[PDB]
Structures are given as C-alpha cells and as structure tokens.
Symmetry: D2
C-alpha cells in the first residue's frame, strides 16, 4: 500500500519502473499514464506517489497537476535548470504533505560513487578519475566523470588541501588526462563496454578505489524505488538522489 502511478509508463525507462513496481511487495501500480491519457486517472485510482520519465515539454504541467492534487512525485525527467526548480519550489510552498524528488541521476551506484568520493577526498593527496564507455559515446569525458571530479575538487578545497603530488616533466600531450578543477580525468572508449567509472585515491602506502559498473543502460529502478519508498519523509523539493540516502 503505496499506490503508485507511472507517467511515461510505455517509455524506455518507464516500462522498467512498471515492472519493478509490479514485482515489489509493498507498492501497488494503480495507473500507467502514457502520452494520450488523462492525468485525472491518478486521482480516480487514488495514486499517492507518481514516477515521472516523460519529456522536458510535458513534465512541468504534469508535475503541477500532481502537486495540486496532493500527489508526491519522483521525477527522473531532465531539463531542470534553476528557473524550473524555482518554479517547483514556488508551487510547493505551504504544502507540508507533498514531496518532490528531482534526481538528475537515478543510478544508485553512480550516486554512491560521487557521495563516497566527496567524503574520501579530504584524506588522500592523490585523486584521479578513469571513465570507460562504449565507443559510440560522443562526449569525453562523461558528464558523470566531470561531476565526480568537481565534487572531489570542492571537497579538497573545503579541507584546504594542496594541489596534487606529481614529478612529471613534459608529459606527452594527453597522457595525464583532462584536468577538471585540478583532478585528472581519463576517458577510455572500448567495444564491449557499457558505462563504468573508477575513482582512485592515494596516500602513503595505500590506495582506495571506488568502482561503478553498469552492465546495461536501463538500471534506474533501484534508485527510483528508493525515491518512492521514502518520499513521505521528504516533504518539499529535494534535488539529487544522494539526499534520500540517509547519509
């Protein structure tokens, strides 16, 4: 008895959420809204939480409906700049029984990787990020690797640390990665692979590495279920799955 609706129920990601919800013991799928269905269906079937993987063009309207009918929302749809977040916050004002989670990344293991990398960064002199993807990826490095590096660098700055140890004299071009706020980032492009990351931290005598591996590109359901299960404790707007992790 969490009654759950899914917007974008027939999309690439939405299907996996319908499946996940059907497998669970505690969640009941009361509505599957695709592009042509009225949202009033969520009201009728008494949805309490909704999960949204739709489009940037649809999501603000739908979200406004949900919030205005008292339904909490777990939103994976992208496109949320500051102005849009300010819009969601404005709608939520004075509504203590409604929560919204906007998570630009729902891959629970990518998220824990960023969280743990930030916590570790205080304690090690050296930090590098290696990212590996299928060779059709256009952008290098990946957005996740850029974010991870920026998080480490902000952690290091907050702890007042030095920039890092390195005796390299005239490294060849490219050998030392892309420098992102002082953190080397290396991007590997490899047939057979999907999406992977390694953060390697180093200090006297030892290292710590945090590795993230996706064996396929449609594994958002564990993160989304963390959202659905916990949103009743997070009234108002929360941005980022990390804030639901209880860390």
């Amino acid at each position: 008895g969490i009654k759950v609706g899914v917007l974008g129920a027939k999309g690439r990601v939405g299907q996996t959420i319908v499946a996940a919800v059907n497998e669970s013991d505690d969640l009941e799928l009361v509505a599957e809204i695709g592009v042509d269905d009225d949202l009033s269906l969520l009201v009728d079937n008494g949805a309490e939480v909704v999960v949204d993987f739709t489009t940037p063009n649809a999501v603000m309207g739908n979200l406004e409906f949900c919030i205005n009918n008292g339904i909490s929302a777990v939103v994976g749809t992208t496109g949320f700049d500051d102005a849009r977040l300010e819009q969601v916050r404005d709608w939520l004002e004075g509504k203590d029984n409604v929560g919204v989670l906007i998570a630009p990344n729902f891959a629970i293991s990518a998220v824990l990787t960023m969280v743990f990398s930030k916590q570790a960064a205080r304690f090690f002199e050296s930090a590098e990020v290696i990212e590996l993807h299928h060779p059709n990826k256009l952008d290098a490095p990946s957005g996740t690797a850029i974010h991870t590096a920026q998080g480490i660098a902000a952690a290091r700055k907050e702890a007042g640390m030095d920039a890092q140890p390195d005796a390299t004299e005239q490294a060849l071009e490219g050998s030392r990665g892309a420098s992102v706020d002082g953190i080397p980032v290396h991007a590997v492009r490899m047939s057979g692979m999907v999406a992977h990351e390694q953060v390697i931290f180093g200090t006297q005598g030892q290292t710590l590495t945090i590795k993230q591996d996706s064996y396929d590109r449609n594994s958002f359901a564990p993160g989304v279920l963390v959202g659905v299960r916990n949103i009743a404790q997070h009234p108002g707007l929360v941005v980022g799955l990390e804030h639901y992790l209880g860390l």
Copy 2:
C-alpha cells in the same frame, strides 16, 4: 605548534610516525620515548599529544601517566579488551581537556572501506568480500575481512533486508567462500601481494566495488596524523578511527 611525543619511537611503526611528524609543517616532535626513557621528558618538553605504538604490557601505565599529566593520546597499541577500555574511561572521568583515541586499525583506506561498505549495504541485494594477501599469512580470512563482513551484515539486518539472491545447486566445497554472518568471504593467497580487500555490491544492472590496496605493511602514518590533528575536538575516549573522520 602541536607539540607531539612518540612512545615506541624506535619501533617498526613508531619510526614512521617520527618521520611523518618531522616532515609536517604543523607538528613539532618534542620527544621520542623508547623503552628506557623516563616519560617525564614529555612533561619537560611540553608535549600536548602523544602517539603510542608500544606493547600491551606498557601501554596502560604510559597512558595513565599521559592522562594524569593532561596529555592527550593517540594509541595504536593493541590489546584493548572491554575491561581495559573501561579502565581508560574511568581515568578520563571529569577531564574535559584530555582526549584519547584507541584505534585498532590506523590504515585510513581499510577504515574508509569499512565505513563505506556499511553505508552502501542498505541499497544492494548482493554483497561479497574478496581479500588477498601474501602467501605467508597464517589466518584466512583476514581479521579485516571478517570485520567488514560483520559490518555489512549488521547494516543489512538494521535495514530489515532479505538474505541474498543465489540459484546455486550443490556448489562444490569451498567455491562460495566462507559465510560470515551470511556474507561470502573469499581469501586469496598470492606471491607478490601485500594486503588487499574488495567489497562488491550488486543490484539490478549495476555494481559498486570498494577496493583497498596496501603496497606495503607500514602505512599507518596518515591515519595517525588524522588522530593527532583532531584529538583536541574529541575529549574523552573514542574507540575507532572512523569516529574521527567527520562522517
């Protein structure tokens, strides 16, 4: 200007602490007590924190001296059962300017590995620990791997989770590791290696792995310096380096 003394200054680990202290910018080595030197030296030279890597036979006396002369202490020496911890706590009663840290493990990367493994364990169905050591190691699995497994299992229990997914019918003896509170633990014994650990967590579509690697057996100084630097914020007795990590 943290004036620091080292007890066991000539021992295997103590030397590395003397070195580390000498390299630093903020810590001044005012005393190096070996087995035949009076501890009053710490009083004379105005030691404020002491670091102890001595023996279980020496440490209680020395610690009692330090605490009774108002010197805080960072203790790596082993042998601290409950009764001994109760003794240290009794001595510290009503002494708001004295801190003691007793850390059964000062390898900052082993410690962060246990901490992060506990935090991650809520979120993944599968969890296994692989530990790898030089082949002269007597005990298998390692104490660190046992502790890590017990921490994961306590985390899982606290989150009310199931025991883990596995369709294995009549696994061969030994193939699935040693079960430690329900967590498989595999011990590899390998020439060339030192001490290494991997915690692998798994859920739909993805994994997270935390790897610890020691490239040699005398890398306790980063953890100990975390102790020395922070003990002024931890009056009383703290047991475990994790509690100094600000997590």
Copy 3:
C-alpha cells in the same frame, strides 16, 4: 566472397551470426536454414562454409550432409563427446578440401584467457581463479573456471613445478576456494553481473592477471567469424577455437 550458410539461423545465437555476416564486407549470406528448410538450399545457393548453432539431435545429420557436399563447417552446437568426434573424423577421411571446426567455446576472450593462462603458468609460483556470475547461475564454479584451472594445473605439472606457497593454518571452511587440481577457484554470485573471470598469477614482487568480462550473454560472433574466415586453412577436424588463433 565467402558464401556462408547459417543453420539455426532463427535461434538465439544463429540470429547474431546472420547479423554479423550481413555487416561484414567479405562474407555473403547465401542461406538461412531453420528447422523446416531443406539443406539442399546450401547446395543451390553455393554455400562454401556453414555455421551451425542448432541442437545435439540435428547436428550430426546436418554435418554429414555438409561434409558430403564438400561444404566446410563451423559448429558451435554442443553435445560432442569422443564417439561423436570420432564419427566426424571418420567422415572427413581422405577429403583434403573440407574442414570442420567444433568449438565448445566461441567467446574469443574466454578462449584467449585459457590459452594465456596455460602459457603463463610455468613462470609463477601462485595461481588462483576467481569467477563471477549473475546470481541465477546454478553451478559453482563455472565450467569455464574448472577448465581454466585444469589447464593451469596441467601446465604446472608439465613444467615439473611444486604445489603452491601458503602458510594458512586452519583456514575457515570455504575461505580458500574449491581446490581444482590444486588451483584455488572462487565463485562469486552477484546481481548486476553477467559472466567474468580472473586468473591471478604471482611471484616475487609482482603479479599478472588476465581478466575476461562478458557484458552480455550473446557475443559469440567474433569467434565464429574467426572460424569462418580461416577454415580454408584447416582441412580436417579441429576441436577448440584456440587452434585457429595462430598461436
């Protein structure tokens, strides 16, 4: 202009071979035989090599047809005990223009892993095999890990080596893996994973590890194309993809 037929063209594996053949520049798909089609189609369309992923019940008949019409064959279908191999060898007697490759494993990376593990084993004192699979796998350890261990052990015996270094006193049950001809084998069962193997070899100061990773269970086409491309240099029966690798 290698004209290629595929038997089992509509099966799980056969489809991937049809696809691969269609993508190539040098191979022309002249026939796709499923269960209800006459094999004479291969003769009509002038097939020169055939690829077989069918069933153990079909394969001997089909293969006999191919060989008797002078068509060479790359066979992935399983079920080939000694008596069946002796049957294939008997049919091939005195037929210098016909080749058959029977490969119990067509995953080019699993095969190179076994080959390289055998070659390395002479030179290292320590050798262990770690295998990791999705947690629905029934058998532990995997057949590939068993074969890999047996290959290492045969290599070691051939080089007259000792059994391996290890100071372990009363290891806990299961901690040291399943012993397979003296090689420890550890099986990890992990949500998110597919099929992976690591062979770790160790000696003074160093290790060598060979890792195999499958990101999905339908990646036999690279190996099969090695077969199709090279079978014209391997008249007669060859068993095992390794013998086509030019090593």
Copy 4:
C-alpha cells in the same frame, strides 16, 4: 650444479640475484664480483653462467672477458644500442657453446604482458593502455607503456586491421590519452602505487584485460633465473627475455 657468478653483486639489483641464487636448489653461487675484484675469479671458481647488473661503462669489457673464457651471460645492464649489439654478435661468431641474453626488461610479468598483448591484438577492434605509477615518476607515459602500445599497433598493422572505433566529437584535451601509433595511452600518477599496467582489449559483447602489478621496484630475479636456467639452450646472442619463454 649451474655454477653462477654475479657481476655487480653488491648493487641494488645484484644483491637480489645473489639472494635468489643462494635460495635455489640447482644453482651454486661461485663468485660475487664487485667493482674492485678481478674477473679471473670466475675462471678459478669455474663459473658457467654469469649475471651482470653493473654499468654501461663496465659491461662491454666484462662481457668480452666472459665470452672469451667460454662463460655464458645474462645481462640486465642497460645501454645496448645497435652498435653495441653488433659488437656482442661479432664476439660470439663461431662459438657454439656460449650464449648471451641481453634483456632490457627482466620483470617477467611486464614481459608476458607485452607478449600476450601482441598476440591478442589481431582479434579485438579496441585496444587501450593504462599505466599507473608513484607520483615521483618524471616521464609520462612510461617507457613500458610506450613499448606495449607500439607492439599492439605493429600487430594490428600486420593483421591489416582498421584504426579503432570511436564516436567522440571534440573530446576535451587530454581526455583520450596520448595517442601512440594509434593506441590510446593514459598515465595515472598516484601516491601509494608502485608500477602497474593494464592493456584492455574490446570487441562485441566482451573484453580482455591483461594487468601487470609490481609491489616493489626490485623483483627482477624470477626473470633472471629464467635466463640462467635456460641459456645453455640459446647459444649466440638473444635480445629480449620473451625469446626465452618458449612461446
């Protein structure tokens, strides 16, 4: 009863060879020549193989002596350009009982890594090299990583392969490594680490990785003992430890 002399017996590497020889069962240390000892000692004590880790200034004289007294030689000393190799070959002419091995790298695991990388390269579309070292290393990438990349690229060219798959549009500077004959090479500089390499190969559905790890910088003895043990089967000059591996 292989009587063995060591030139440079008191040097960093020579000591480890003296140790190794003393531990063995089959080799007898009959001479330890340092800088001030006559080489005639090798003749007196009936040395049959000599191991040389000295200096580029000493080695040609010493080697000429050894060869002219019929003693075979396993030479790790560096400095051997073509002209010097031509000199060694000239001295060895018509001397069927004398062998010399000049090995620019004696780390058995680095060598097997290059050998296996060359053999694998025919079969995979994607190939990258990641190298990791202590952060005092001056040069990036490492010489071993450069050599490994050049070997892969020569293998690929010999097999007539394409250059590699990659959809990357305007990668950031440095993100894709240093291109070495078309093979990406990434150099990581990390406190705690020693010297490590990974060659990652990729094709549809799968990868193969070969990892080399040194846990300390003085692990040449296994390779050198391969030399000493086998040199009696390699009369004349051989350059490179790989040629002694029986591959």
